[PDB]
Amino acid sequence: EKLFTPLKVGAVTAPNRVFMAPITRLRSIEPGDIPTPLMGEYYRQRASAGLIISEATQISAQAKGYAGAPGLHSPEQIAAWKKITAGVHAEDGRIAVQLWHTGRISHSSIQPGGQAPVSASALNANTRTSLRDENGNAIRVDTTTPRALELDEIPGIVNDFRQAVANAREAGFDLVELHSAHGYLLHQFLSPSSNQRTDQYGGSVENRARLVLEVVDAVCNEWSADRIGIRVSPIGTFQNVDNGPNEEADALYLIEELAKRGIAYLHMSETDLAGGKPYSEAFRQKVRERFHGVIIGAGAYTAEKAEDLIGKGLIDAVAFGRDYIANPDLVARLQKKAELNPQRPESFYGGGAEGYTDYPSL
Ligand SMILES: Cc1cc2nc3c(=O)[nH]c(=O)nc-3n(C[C@H](O)[C@H](O)[C@H](O)COP(=O)(O)O)c2cc1C
């Protein structure tokens, strides 16, 4: 077994390879999109993870697409996250913040000024997002058609990622994960399906990857490359965003570019909850010979599959989502081959402590 051995992840050393995937839970305070002490308890319970990766967190108010998702742009958000990371560190854990801009997976009612959300192009996502009703309960609502960003608005988006990384470092996070997956803003630019621009930010793969690489460079300069990870979902379809007709070649272009920056890790979300074709081992080997940081795999993994791929020299760590929702001591359970707590999906999104902090350890 290698799952219970240490791994150097940029500037941090994880004691095991069992990571907590980023999981949106929609329990923040409104107004202000403020993290809470309840969220702090939830993360502290999971501090034995080799690395915790937080729920997706807004870089700015414009970044918001889901009612109840936290931000990392305001003074009050910084102060609340500082308490949360201090609690994880008091339990000897490590925590990364996942930073996003939702782009077109959003609704005008939760944008600044009630305006349409932004994207690469003025194309509706044709999906839903999560709002709150008048009683504070999570509800699903069709996405609003976005406005295409003007060329002169792109530097501001880059700066918003940079600023959020400055804030994250101050807030005590160990690493930052850029959310470049699942059809959110960075992925909206990467994918030809969602990006019909004819300027330097659309068309060729070089142009489609331009924004995400500008963001990577800005955040490495703000902090250090060994503090930066990135999550991609570059093979298959996620939230109606496919990866275009040359997905493998385009993914390998992006990964070779990322490798040049010496970033801490590449986190691959391999399939959504409905599943799909597995990554081929040939593709995994092409990724591995191009990237020389840590590779994290995710998407309906088992411990056995993680061991197999770590033993083949193809990935370094696994991130578990739903098993981490339900098992605060997932590491110990996998080590001991114990049963896993029964999951309660009704309480994944929204609500309070029930189905959040009430799953027991062994
Ligand atoms: C309730 C829920 C919320 C999620 N929120 C995020 C998120 O904030 N960021 C992200 O990149 N992926 C998110 N995901 C995907 C998970 O990180 C993970 O990749 C996925 O759950 C598949 O892995 P699993 O079979 O281990 O659960 C979410 C998944 C679920 C079920």
mmCIF file with all atom_site columns, C-alpha atoms in Angstrom, residues 62-258:
data_model
loop_
_atom_site.group_PDB
_atom_site.id
_atom_site.type_symbol
_atom_site.label_atom_id
_atom_site.label_alt_id
_atom_site.label_comp_id
_atom_site.label_asym_id
_atom_site.label_entity_id
_atom_site.label_seq_id
_atom_site.pdbx_PDB_ins_code
_atom_site.Cartn_x
_atom_site.Cartn_y
_atom_site.Cartn_z
_atom_site.occupancy
_atom_site.B_iso_or_equiv
_atom_site.pdbx_formal_charge
_atom_site.auth_seq_id
_atom_site.auth_comp_id
_atom_site.auth_asym_id
_atom_site.auth_atom_id
_atom_site.pdbx_PDB_model_num
ATOM 1   C CA . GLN A 1 62  ? -19.156 39.039 -9.865  1.00 0.00 ? 62  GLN A CA 1
ATOM 2   C CA . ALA A 1 63  ? -17.779 35.493 -9.586  1.00 0.00 ? 63  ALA A CA 1
ATOM 3   C CA . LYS A 1 64  ? -20.864 34.348 -7.630  1.00 0.00 ? 64  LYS A CA 1
ATOM 4   C CA . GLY A 1 65  ? -23.192 31.825 -9.235  1.00 0.00 ? 65  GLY A CA 1
ATOM 5   C CA . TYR A 1 66  ? -24.664 29.893 -6.283  1.00 0.00 ? 66  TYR A CA 1
ATOM 6   C CA . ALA A 1 67  ? -26.505 31.259 -3.229  1.00 0.00 ? 67  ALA A CA 1
ATOM 7   C CA . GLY A 1 68  ? -24.671 30.084 -0.112  1.00 0.00 ? 68  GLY A CA 1
ATOM 8   C CA . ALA A 1 69  ? -21.220 29.669 -1.712  1.00 0.00 ? 69  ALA A CA 1
ATOM 9   C CA . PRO A 1 70  ? -18.507 31.618 0.178   1.00 0.00 ? 70  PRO A CA 1
ATOM 10  C CA . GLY A 1 71  ? -16.230 34.370 -1.086  1.00 0.00 ? 71  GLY A CA 1
ATOM 11  C CA . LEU A 1 72  ? -12.627 35.398 -0.473  1.00 0.00 ? 72  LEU A CA 1
ATOM 12  C CA . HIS A 1 73  ? -12.825 39.043 -1.640  1.00 0.00 ? 73  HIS A CA 1
ATOM 13  C CA . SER A 1 74  ? -14.117 41.011 1.398   1.00 0.00 ? 74  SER A CA 1
ATOM 14  C CA . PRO A 1 75  ? -12.540 41.831 4.784   1.00 0.00 ? 75  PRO A CA 1
ATOM 15  C CA . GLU A 1 76  ? -15.256 39.887 6.610   1.00 0.00 ? 76  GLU A CA 1
ATOM 16  C CA . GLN A 1 77  ? -14.681 36.808 4.434   1.00 0.00 ? 77  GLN A CA 1
ATOM 17  C CA . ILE A 1 78  ? -10.918 36.987 5.077   1.00 0.00 ? 78  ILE A CA 1
ATOM 18  C CA . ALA A 1 79  ? -11.530 37.205 8.849   1.00 0.00 ? 79  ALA A CA 1
ATOM 19  C CA . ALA A 1 80  ? -13.925 34.240 8.846   1.00 0.00 ? 80  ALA A CA 1
ATOM 20  C CA . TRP A 1 81  ? -11.615 32.039 6.731   1.00 0.00 ? 81  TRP A CA 1
ATOM 21  C CA . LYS A 1 82  ? -8.690  32.921 9.043   1.00 0.00 ? 82  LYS A CA 1
ATOM 22  C CA . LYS A 1 83  ? -10.550 31.261 11.930  1.00 0.00 ? 83  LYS A CA 1
ATOM 23  C CA . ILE A 1 84  ? -11.309 28.188 9.779   1.00 0.00 ? 84  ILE A CA 1
ATOM 24  C CA . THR A 1 85  ? -7.733  27.638 8.659   1.00 0.00 ? 85  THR A CA 1
ATOM 25  C CA . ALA A 1 86  ? -6.468  28.186 12.215  1.00 0.00 ? 86  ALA A CA 1
ATOM 26  C CA . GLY A 1 87  ? -8.784  25.418 13.379  1.00 0.00 ? 87  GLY A CA 1
ATOM 27  C CA . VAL A 1 88  ? -7.536  22.999 10.697  1.00 0.00 ? 88  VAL A CA 1
ATOM 28  C CA . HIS A 1 89  ? -3.935  23.845 11.581  1.00 0.00 ? 89  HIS A CA 1
ATOM 29  C CA . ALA A 1 90  ? -4.610  23.289 15.307  1.00 0.00 ? 90  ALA A CA 1
ATOM 30  C CA . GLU A 1 91  ? -5.502  19.680 14.311  1.00 0.00 ? 91  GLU A CA 1
ATOM 31  C CA . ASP A 1 92  ? -2.293  19.356 12.241  1.00 0.00 ? 92  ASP A CA 1
ATOM 32  C CA . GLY A 1 93  ? -4.121  19.466 8.895   1.00 0.00 ? 93  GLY A CA 1
ATOM 33  C CA . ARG A 1 94  ? -3.423  21.187 5.561   1.00 0.00 ? 94  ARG A CA 1
ATOM 34  C CA . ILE A 1 95  ? -6.021  23.116 3.563   1.00 0.00 ? 95  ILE A CA 1
ATOM 35  C CA . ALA A 1 96  ? -6.132  24.539 0.046   1.00 0.00 ? 96  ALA A CA 1
ATOM 36  C CA . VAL A 1 97  ? -8.797  26.997 -1.093  1.00 0.00 ? 97  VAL A CA 1
ATOM 37  C CA . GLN A 1 98  ? -10.464 26.275 -4.444  1.00 0.00 ? 98  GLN A CA 1
ATOM 38  C CA . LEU A 1 99  ? -10.968 29.638 -6.201  1.00 0.00 ? 99  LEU A CA 1
ATOM 39  C CA . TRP A 1 100 ? -13.568 30.090 -8.936  1.00 0.00 ? 100 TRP A CA 1
ATOM 40  C CA . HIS A 1 101 ? -15.438 32.469 -11.157 1.00 0.00 ? 101 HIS A CA 1
ATOM 41  C CA . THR A 1 102 ? -18.691 30.802 -12.181 1.00 0.00 ? 102 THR A CA 1
ATOM 42  C CA . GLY A 1 103 ? -19.121 32.773 -15.411 1.00 0.00 ? 103 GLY A CA 1
ATOM 43  C CA . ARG A 1 104 ? -22.312 31.798 -17.189 1.00 0.00 ? 104 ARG A CA 1
ATOM 44  C CA . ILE A 1 105 ? -23.305 29.143 -14.565 1.00 0.00 ? 105 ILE A CA 1
ATOM 45  C CA . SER A 1 106 ? -25.056 31.888 -12.609 1.00 0.00 ? 106 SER A CA 1
ATOM 46  C CA . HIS A 1 107 ? -28.241 33.960 -12.372 1.00 0.00 ? 107 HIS A CA 1
ATOM 47  C CA . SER A 1 108 ? -28.778 37.721 -12.658 1.00 0.00 ? 108 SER A CA 1
ATOM 48  C CA . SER A 1 109 ? -30.584 37.876 -9.281  1.00 0.00 ? 109 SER A CA 1
ATOM 49  C CA . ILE A 1 110 ? -27.272 37.127 -7.455  1.00 0.00 ? 110 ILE A CA 1
ATOM 50  C CA . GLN A 1 111 ? -24.982 39.273 -9.606  1.00 0.00 ? 111 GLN A CA 1
ATOM 51  C CA . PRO A 1 112 ? -23.917 42.828 -8.683  1.00 0.00 ? 112 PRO A CA 1
ATOM 52  C CA . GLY A 1 113 ? -26.673 45.224 -9.724  1.00 0.00 ? 113 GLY A CA 1
ATOM 53  C CA . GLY A 1 114 ? -28.882 42.317 -10.828 1.00 0.00 ? 114 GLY A CA 1
ATOM 54  C CA . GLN A 1 115 ? -27.075 42.197 -14.171 1.00 0.00 ? 115 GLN A CA 1
ATOM 55  C CA . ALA A 1 116 ? -26.435 39.263 -16.517 1.00 0.00 ? 116 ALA A CA 1
ATOM 56  C CA . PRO A 1 117 ? -23.367 37.168 -15.580 1.00 0.00 ? 117 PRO A CA 1
ATOM 57  C CA . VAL A 1 118 ? -20.290 37.231 -17.809 1.00 0.00 ? 118 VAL A CA 1
ATOM 58  C CA . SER A 1 119 ? -18.606 34.652 -20.042 1.00 0.00 ? 119 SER A CA 1
ATOM 59  C CA . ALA A 1 120 ? -16.368 34.219 -23.099 1.00 0.00 ? 120 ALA A CA 1
ATOM 60  C CA . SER A 1 121 ? -19.427 34.501 -25.373 1.00 0.00 ? 121 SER A CA 1
ATOM 61  C CA . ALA A 1 122 ? -23.137 35.374 -25.075 1.00 0.00 ? 122 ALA A CA 1
ATOM 62  C CA . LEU A 1 123 ? -24.350 31.759 -24.975 1.00 0.00 ? 123 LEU A CA 1
ATOM 63  C CA . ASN A 1 124 ? -26.660 30.364 -22.281 1.00 0.00 ? 124 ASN A CA 1
ATOM 64  C CA . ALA A 1 125 ? -25.236 27.374 -20.366 1.00 0.00 ? 125 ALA A CA 1
ATOM 65  C CA . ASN A 1 126 ? -28.637 25.656 -20.687 1.00 0.00 ? 126 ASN A CA 1
ATOM 66  C CA . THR A 1 127 ? -28.390 24.208 -17.188 1.00 0.00 ? 127 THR A CA 1
ATOM 67  C CA . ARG A 1 128 ? -29.342 25.171 -13.644 1.00 0.00 ? 128 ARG A CA 1
ATOM 68  C CA . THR A 1 129 ? -27.693 26.771 -10.649 1.00 0.00 ? 129 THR A CA 1
ATOM 69  C CA . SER A 1 130 ? -28.683 26.862 -6.949  1.00 0.00 ? 130 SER A CA 1
ATOM 70  C CA . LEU A 1 131 ? -30.444 29.894 -5.437  1.00 0.00 ? 131 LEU A CA 1
ATOM 71  C CA . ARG A 1 132 ? -32.179 30.249 -2.050  1.00 0.00 ? 132 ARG A CA 1
ATOM 72  C CA . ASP A 1 133 ? -35.906 30.680 -1.575  1.00 0.00 ? 133 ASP A CA 1
ATOM 73  C CA . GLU A 1 134 ? -37.526 33.172 0.798   1.00 0.00 ? 134 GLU A CA 1
ATOM 74  C CA . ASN A 1 135 ? -36.929 30.788 3.716   1.00 0.00 ? 135 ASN A CA 1
ATOM 75  C CA . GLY A 1 136 ? -33.238 30.288 2.996   1.00 0.00 ? 136 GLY A CA 1
ATOM 76  C CA . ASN A 1 137 ? -33.584 26.828 1.414   1.00 0.00 ? 137 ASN A CA 1
ATOM 77  C CA . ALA A 1 138 ? -31.621 25.716 -1.639  1.00 0.00 ? 138 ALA A CA 1
ATOM 78  C CA . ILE A 1 139 ? -33.594 25.704 -4.937  1.00 0.00 ? 139 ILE A CA 1
ATOM 79  C CA . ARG A 1 140 ? -32.513 25.030 -8.528  1.00 0.00 ? 140 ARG A CA 1
ATOM 80  C CA . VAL A 1 141 ? -33.084 27.724 -11.205 1.00 0.00 ? 141 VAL A CA 1
ATOM 81  C CA . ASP A 1 142 ? -32.284 27.961 -14.924 1.00 0.00 ? 142 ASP A CA 1
ATOM 82  C CA . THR A 1 143 ? -29.104 29.888 -15.771 1.00 0.00 ? 143 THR A CA 1
ATOM 83  C CA . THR A 1 144 ? -29.252 33.453 -17.165 1.00 0.00 ? 144 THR A CA 1
ATOM 84  C CA . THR A 1 145 ? -27.873 34.176 -20.643 1.00 0.00 ? 145 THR A CA 1
ATOM 85  C CA . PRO A 1 146 ? -24.444 35.810 -20.145 1.00 0.00 ? 146 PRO A CA 1
ATOM 86  C CA . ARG A 1 147 ? -22.811 38.910 -21.547 1.00 0.00 ? 147 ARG A CA 1
ATOM 87  C CA . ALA A 1 148 ? -19.561 38.367 -23.443 1.00 0.00 ? 148 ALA A CA 1
ATOM 88  C CA . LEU A 1 149 ? -16.597 40.027 -21.698 1.00 0.00 ? 149 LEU A CA 1
ATOM 89  C CA . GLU A 1 150 ? -15.071 42.921 -23.573 1.00 0.00 ? 150 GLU A CA 1
ATOM 90  C CA . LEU A 1 151 ? -11.377 42.553 -24.418 1.00 0.00 ? 151 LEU A CA 1
ATOM 91  C CA . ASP A 1 152 ? -10.565 45.404 -22.024 1.00 0.00 ? 152 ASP A CA 1
ATOM 92  C CA . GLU A 1 153 ? -12.271 43.559 -19.142 1.00 0.00 ? 153 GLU A CA 1
ATOM 93  C CA . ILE A 1 154 ? -9.864  40.584 -19.289 1.00 0.00 ? 154 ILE A CA 1
ATOM 94  C CA . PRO A 1 155 ? -7.030  42.204 -17.233 1.00 0.00 ? 155 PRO A CA 1
ATOM 95  C CA . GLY A 1 156 ? -9.532  42.856 -14.465 1.00 0.00 ? 156 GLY A CA 1
ATOM 96  C CA . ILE A 1 157 ? -10.482 39.160 -14.310 1.00 0.00 ? 157 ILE A CA 1
ATOM 97  C CA . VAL A 1 158 ? -6.787  38.241 -14.046 1.00 0.00 ? 158 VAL A CA 1
ATOM 98  C CA . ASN A 1 159 ? -6.352  40.810 -11.280 1.00 0.00 ? 159 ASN A CA 1
ATOM 99  C CA . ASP A 1 160 ? -9.372  39.400 -9.407  1.00 0.00 ? 160 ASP A CA 1
ATOM 100 C CA . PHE A 1 161 ? -7.720  35.953 -9.320  1.00 0.00 ? 161 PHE A CA 1
ATOM 101 C CA . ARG A 1 162 ? -4.415  37.577 -8.209  1.00 0.00 ? 162 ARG A CA 1
ATOM 102 C CA . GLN A 1 163 ? -6.139  39.579 -5.464  1.00 0.00 ? 163 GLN A CA 1
ATOM 103 C CA . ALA A 1 164 ? -8.035  36.530 -4.213  1.00 0.00 ? 164 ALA A CA 1
ATOM 104 C CA . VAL A 1 165 ? -4.714  34.647 -3.963  1.00 0.00 ? 165 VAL A CA 1
ATOM 105 C CA . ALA A 1 166 ? -3.217  37.511 -1.902  1.00 0.00 ? 166 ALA A CA 1
ATOM 106 C CA . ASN A 1 167 ? -6.304  37.235 0.314   1.00 0.00 ? 167 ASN A CA 1
ATOM 107 C CA . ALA A 1 168 ? -5.994  33.425 0.515   1.00 0.00 ? 168 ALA A CA 1
ATOM 108 C CA . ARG A 1 169 ? -2.362  33.590 1.607   1.00 0.00 ? 169 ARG A CA 1
ATOM 109 C CA . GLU A 1 170 ? -3.339  36.108 4.298   1.00 0.00 ? 170 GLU A CA 1
ATOM 110 C CA . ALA A 1 171 ? -6.288  33.900 5.345   1.00 0.00 ? 171 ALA A CA 1
ATOM 111 C CA . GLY A 1 172 ? -3.870  31.058 6.149   1.00 0.00 ? 172 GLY A CA 1
ATOM 112 C CA . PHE A 1 173 ? -4.497  28.596 3.322   1.00 0.00 ? 173 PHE A CA 1
ATOM 113 C CA . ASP A 1 174 ? -1.541  26.306 2.543   1.00 0.00 ? 174 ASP A CA 1
ATOM 114 C CA . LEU A 1 175 ? -2.234  26.192 -1.223  1.00 0.00 ? 175 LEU A CA 1
ATOM 115 C CA . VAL A 1 176 ? -4.646  27.567 -3.824  1.00 0.00 ? 176 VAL A CA 1
ATOM 116 C CA . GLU A 1 177 ? -6.510  25.434 -6.396  1.00 0.00 ? 177 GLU A CA 1
ATOM 117 C CA . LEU A 1 178 ? -7.672  27.282 -9.520  1.00 0.00 ? 178 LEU A CA 1
ATOM 118 C CA . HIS A 1 179 ? -11.108 25.985 -10.660 1.00 0.00 ? 179 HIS A CA 1
ATOM 119 C CA . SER A 1 180 ? -10.435 25.445 -14.380 1.00 0.00 ? 180 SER A CA 1
ATOM 120 C CA . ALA A 1 181 ? -13.013 22.614 -14.652 1.00 0.00 ? 181 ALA A CA 1
ATOM 121 C CA . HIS A 1 182 ? -16.731 21.757 -14.804 1.00 0.00 ? 182 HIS A CA 1
ATOM 122 C CA . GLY A 1 183 ? -17.869 24.471 -17.191 1.00 0.00 ? 183 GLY A CA 1
ATOM 123 C CA . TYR A 1 184 ? -17.019 27.487 -14.973 1.00 0.00 ? 184 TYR A CA 1
ATOM 124 C CA . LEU A 1 185 ? -15.387 30.667 -16.343 1.00 0.00 ? 185 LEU A CA 1
ATOM 125 C CA . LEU A 1 186 ? -11.881 29.382 -17.066 1.00 0.00 ? 186 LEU A CA 1
ATOM 126 C CA . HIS A 1 187 ? -13.342 26.245 -18.729 1.00 0.00 ? 187 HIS A CA 1
ATOM 127 C CA . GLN A 1 188 ? -15.800 28.457 -20.689 1.00 0.00 ? 188 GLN A CA 1
ATOM 128 C CA . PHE A 1 189 ? -12.766 30.053 -22.357 1.00 0.00 ? 189 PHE A CA 1
ATOM 129 C CA . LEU A 1 190 ? -10.923 26.720 -22.843 1.00 0.00 ? 190 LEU A CA 1
ATOM 130 C CA . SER A 1 191 ? -13.814 24.963 -24.619 1.00 0.00 ? 191 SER A CA 1
ATOM 131 C CA . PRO A 1 192 ? -14.723 25.725 -28.290 1.00 0.00 ? 192 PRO A CA 1
ATOM 132 C CA . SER A 1 193 ? -18.331 24.867 -27.397 1.00 0.00 ? 193 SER A CA 1
ATOM 133 C CA . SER A 1 194 ? -18.641 27.884 -25.090 1.00 0.00 ? 194 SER A CA 1
ATOM 134 C CA . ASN A 1 195 ? -16.036 30.184 -26.666 1.00 0.00 ? 195 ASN A CA 1
ATOM 135 C CA . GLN A 1 196 ? -16.894 31.697 -30.083 1.00 0.00 ? 196 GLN A CA 1
ATOM 136 C CA . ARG A 1 197 ? -14.620 34.738 -29.709 1.00 0.00 ? 197 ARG A CA 1
ATOM 137 C CA . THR A 1 198 ? -12.559 36.017 -32.641 1.00 0.00 ? 198 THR A CA 1
ATOM 138 C CA . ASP A 1 199 ? -9.970  38.020 -30.650 1.00 0.00 ? 199 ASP A CA 1
ATOM 139 C CA . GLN A 1 200 ? -6.798  36.758 -28.932 1.00 0.00 ? 200 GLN A CA 1
ATOM 140 C CA . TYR A 1 201 ? -8.938  34.864 -26.338 1.00 0.00 ? 201 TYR A CA 1
ATOM 141 C CA . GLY A 1 202 ? -10.728 32.544 -28.790 1.00 0.00 ? 202 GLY A CA 1
ATOM 142 C CA . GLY A 1 203 ? -10.170 30.360 -31.866 1.00 0.00 ? 203 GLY A CA 1
ATOM 143 C CA . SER A 1 204 ? -6.875  28.468 -31.610 1.00 0.00 ? 204 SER A CA 1
ATOM 144 C CA . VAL A 1 205 ? -6.090  26.382 -28.529 1.00 0.00 ? 205 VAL A CA 1
ATOM 145 C CA . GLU A 1 206 ? -3.320  28.875 -27.708 1.00 0.00 ? 206 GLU A CA 1
ATOM 146 C CA . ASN A 1 207 ? -5.946  31.639 -27.621 1.00 0.00 ? 207 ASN A CA 1
ATOM 147 C CA . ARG A 1 208 ? -8.516  29.546 -25.701 1.00 0.00 ? 208 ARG A CA 1
ATOM 148 C CA . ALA A 1 209 ? -5.935  28.691 -23.015 1.00 0.00 ? 209 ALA A CA 1
ATOM 149 C CA . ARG A 1 210 ? -4.592  32.293 -22.915 1.00 0.00 ? 210 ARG A CA 1
ATOM 150 C CA . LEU A 1 211 ? -6.780  33.437 -19.993 1.00 0.00 ? 211 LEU A CA 1
ATOM 151 C CA . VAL A 1 212 ? -6.078  30.443 -17.750 1.00 0.00 ? 212 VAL A CA 1
ATOM 152 C CA . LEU A 1 213 ? -2.323  30.740 -18.398 1.00 0.00 ? 213 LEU A CA 1
ATOM 153 C CA . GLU A 1 214 ? -2.391  34.500 -17.652 1.00 0.00 ? 214 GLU A CA 1
ATOM 154 C CA . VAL A 1 215 ? -4.169  33.633 -14.370 1.00 0.00 ? 215 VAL A CA 1
ATOM 155 C CA . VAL A 1 216 ? -1.586  30.953 -13.526 1.00 0.00 ? 216 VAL A CA 1
ATOM 156 C CA . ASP A 1 217 ? 1.270   33.368 -14.196 1.00 0.00 ? 217 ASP A CA 1
ATOM 157 C CA . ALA A 1 218 ? -0.353  36.157 -12.145 1.00 0.00 ? 218 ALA A CA 1
ATOM 158 C CA . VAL A 1 219 ? -0.975  33.933 -9.117  1.00 0.00 ? 219 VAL A CA 1
ATOM 159 C CA . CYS A 1 220 ? 2.508   32.358 -9.221  1.00 0.00 ? 220 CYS A CA 1
ATOM 160 C CA . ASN A 1 221 ? 3.960   35.889 -9.218  1.00 0.00 ? 221 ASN A CA 1
ATOM 161 C CA . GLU A 1 222 ? 1.707   36.976 -6.339  1.00 0.00 ? 222 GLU A CA 1
ATOM 162 C CA . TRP A 1 223 ? 2.693   34.000 -4.144  1.00 0.00 ? 223 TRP A CA 1
ATOM 163 C CA . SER A 1 224 ? 4.952   31.214 -5.494  1.00 0.00 ? 224 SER A CA 1
ATOM 164 C CA . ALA A 1 225 ? 4.476   28.470 -8.083  1.00 0.00 ? 225 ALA A CA 1
ATOM 165 C CA . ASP A 1 226 ? 4.863   25.805 -5.381  1.00 0.00 ? 226 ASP A CA 1
ATOM 166 C CA . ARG A 1 227 ? 1.661   27.155 -3.770  1.00 0.00 ? 227 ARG A CA 1
ATOM 167 C CA . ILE A 1 228 ? -0.553  26.824 -6.889  1.00 0.00 ? 228 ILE A CA 1
ATOM 168 C CA . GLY A 1 229 ? -2.618  23.875 -8.093  1.00 0.00 ? 229 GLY A CA 1
ATOM 169 C CA . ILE A 1 230 ? -5.176  23.697 -10.884 1.00 0.00 ? 230 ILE A CA 1
ATOM 170 C CA . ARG A 1 231 ? -8.257  21.548 -11.422 1.00 0.00 ? 231 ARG A CA 1
ATOM 171 C CA . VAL A 1 232 ? -9.161  20.581 -15.001 1.00 0.00 ? 232 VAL A CA 1
ATOM 172 C CA . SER A 1 233 ? -11.846 18.359 -16.531 1.00 0.00 ? 233 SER A CA 1
ATOM 173 C CA . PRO A 1 234 ? -10.423 18.284 -20.046 1.00 0.00 ? 234 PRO A CA 1
ATOM 174 C CA . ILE A 1 235 ? -11.771 14.952 -21.394 1.00 0.00 ? 235 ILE A CA 1
ATOM 175 C CA . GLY A 1 236 ? -15.543 14.470 -21.790 1.00 0.00 ? 236 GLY A CA 1
ATOM 176 C CA . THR A 1 237 ? -18.578 16.648 -21.080 1.00 0.00 ? 237 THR A CA 1
ATOM 177 C CA . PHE A 1 238 ? -19.265 18.465 -17.792 1.00 0.00 ? 238 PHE A CA 1
ATOM 178 C CA . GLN A 1 239 ? -22.344 20.660 -17.181 1.00 0.00 ? 239 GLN A CA 1
ATOM 179 C CA . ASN A 1 240 ? -23.005 20.782 -20.962 1.00 0.00 ? 240 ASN A CA 1
ATOM 180 C CA . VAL A 1 241 ? -19.502 21.995 -21.753 1.00 0.00 ? 241 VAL A CA 1
ATOM 181 C CA . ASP A 1 242 ? -17.637 19.507 -23.923 1.00 0.00 ? 242 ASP A CA 1
ATOM 182 C CA . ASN A 1 243 ? -13.931 19.872 -24.649 1.00 0.00 ? 243 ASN A CA 1
ATOM 183 C CA . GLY A 1 244 ? -14.223 20.321 -28.390 1.00 0.00 ? 244 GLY A CA 1
ATOM 184 C CA . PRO A 1 245 ? -13.253 18.056 -31.277 1.00 0.00 ? 245 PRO A CA 1
ATOM 185 C CA . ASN A 1 246 ? -9.532  17.772 -30.418 1.00 0.00 ? 246 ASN A CA 1
ATOM 186 C CA . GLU A 1 247 ? -9.826  17.303 -26.674 1.00 0.00 ? 247 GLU A CA 1
ATOM 187 C CA . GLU A 1 248 ? -6.765  15.116 -26.088 1.00 0.00 ? 248 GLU A CA 1
ATOM 188 C CA . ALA A 1 249 ? -4.339  17.215 -28.116 1.00 0.00 ? 249 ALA A CA 1
ATOM 189 C CA . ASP A 1 250 ? -5.720  20.409 -26.579 1.00 0.00 ? 250 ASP A CA 1
ATOM 190 C CA . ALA A 1 251 ? -5.414  18.986 -23.051 1.00 0.00 ? 251 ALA A CA 1
ATOM 191 C CA . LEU A 1 252 ? -1.787  17.991 -23.671 1.00 0.00 ? 252 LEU A CA 1
ATOM 192 C CA . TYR A 1 253 ? -1.010  21.506 -24.955 1.00 0.00 ? 253 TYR A CA 1
ATOM 193 C CA . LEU A 1 254 ? -2.415  23.036 -21.746 1.00 0.00 ? 254 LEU A CA 1
ATOM 194 C CA . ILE A 1 255 ? -0.569  20.519 -19.536 1.00 0.00 ? 255 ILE A CA 1
ATOM 195 C CA . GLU A 1 256 ? 2.796   21.132 -21.243 1.00 0.00 ? 256 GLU A CA 1
ATOM 196 C CA . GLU A 1 257 ? 2.272   24.864 -20.719 1.00 0.00 ? 257 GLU A CA 1
ATOM 197 C CA . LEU A 1 258 ? 1.366   24.358 -17.046 1.00 0.00 ? 258 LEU A CA 1
#
